[PDB]
């Protein structure tokens, strides 16, 4: 269960990158370290920083690069943890093209459960891999940018950079 983490600056502000032995297991965004670290401790409790792990620090620099660019895919291995339903929702987020948004209902319609709009909504707000799993791309259909796990200012910022020119 070993989980390593680092804190770095990025265009969206402060982020925490975390890595287990399977791959990047959390990418969290925020304004202050205390909160990122307890947020991470909530899901991965004895997670520790690893400043001298040369090989982890490289991976963090790779993850940051994706994070600051408009459409740079994260190649490193992902450690996606969740239920079949969450996994189905997150896998379908990843097929949303950079520059488009789908509403919760369209997403529920696309995965074969027109009925489960609420649960799809919840699956998006439970994403632990900011940006890499593009949960900023799903919107409630009414024109509002609510529902993002890391706030309206970052959701809005992300959508504005992908819908460019």
UniProtKB/Swiss-Prot annotation:
Organism phylogeny: Bacteria, Pseudomonadati, Pseudomonadota, Gammaproteobacteria, Enterobacterales
Annotated GO MF terms: DNA-binding transcription factor activity; methylated-DNA-[protein]-cysteine S-methyltransferase activity; sequence-specific DNA binding; zinc ion binding
Family per similarity comment: In the C-terminal section; belongs to the MGMT family.
UniProt entry tagged with the keyword DNA-binding: yes
Region (Methylated-DNA--protein-cysteine methyltransferase) location: 1-165
Protein name, entry field: Bifunctional transcriptional activator/DNA repair enzyme Ada
Induction info: Up-regulated by methylated Ada itself in response to the exposure to alkylating agents.
Its job: Involved in the adaptive response to alkylation damage in DNA caused by alkylating agents. Repairs O6-methylguanine (O6-MeG) and O4-methylthymine (O4-MeT) in DNA. Repairs the methylated nucleobase in DNA by stoichiometrically transferring the methyl group to a cysteine residue in the enzyme (Cys-135). Cannot demethylate the other diastereomer, Rp-methylphosphotriester.
Signal peptide annotation: none
Domain notes for this protein: Consists of two domains. The 20 kDa N-terminal domain repairs the Sp diastereomer of methylphosphotriesters and, in its methylated form, binds DNA in a sequence-specific manner. The 19 kDa C-terminal domain repairs the mutagenic lesions O6-methylguanine. Each domain retains its activity when separated form the other.
Entry superkingdom: Bacteria
Record's keyword terms, sorted: Activator, DNA damage, DNA repair, DNA-binding, Metal-binding, Methyltransferase, Multifunctional enzyme, Transcription, Transcription regulation, Transferase, Zinc
Residues the record marks as active site: 135
Residues of the full protein shown: 187 to 351 of 354
Note from the entry: This enzyme catalyzes only one turnover and therefore is not strictly catalytic. According to one definition, an enzyme is a biocatalyst that acts repeatedly and over many reaction cycles.
Organism: Escherichia coli (strain K12)
GO biological process: DNA alkylation repair; DNA damage response; methylation; negative regulation of DNA-templated transcription; positive regulation of DNA-templated transcription
